[PDB]
Amino acid sequence: RSFHLEASLMDALLNDRPEFVRLLISHGLSLGHFLTPMRLAQLYSAAPSN
Numbered sequence: 428r429s430f431h432l433e434a435s436l437m438d439a440l441l442n443d444r445p446e447f448v449r450l451l452i453s454h455g456l457s458l459g460h461f462l463t464p465m466r467l468a469q470l471y472s473a474a475p476s477n
Contacts, residue, residue: 441473
């Protein structure tokens with residue numbers, strides 16, 4: 428479903444794992460509902476403290 432791939436995309440963006448990212452966007456995602464400001468803040472929070 429949509430959310431099952433959305434969560435996998437969140438994970439594959441939080442960690443590097445470029446192969447999973449390539450496979451996911453190759454298979455097709457939303458890219459219109461995946462960019463909510465909450466998710467933007469969550470991904471921005473992934474920056475290392477040091």
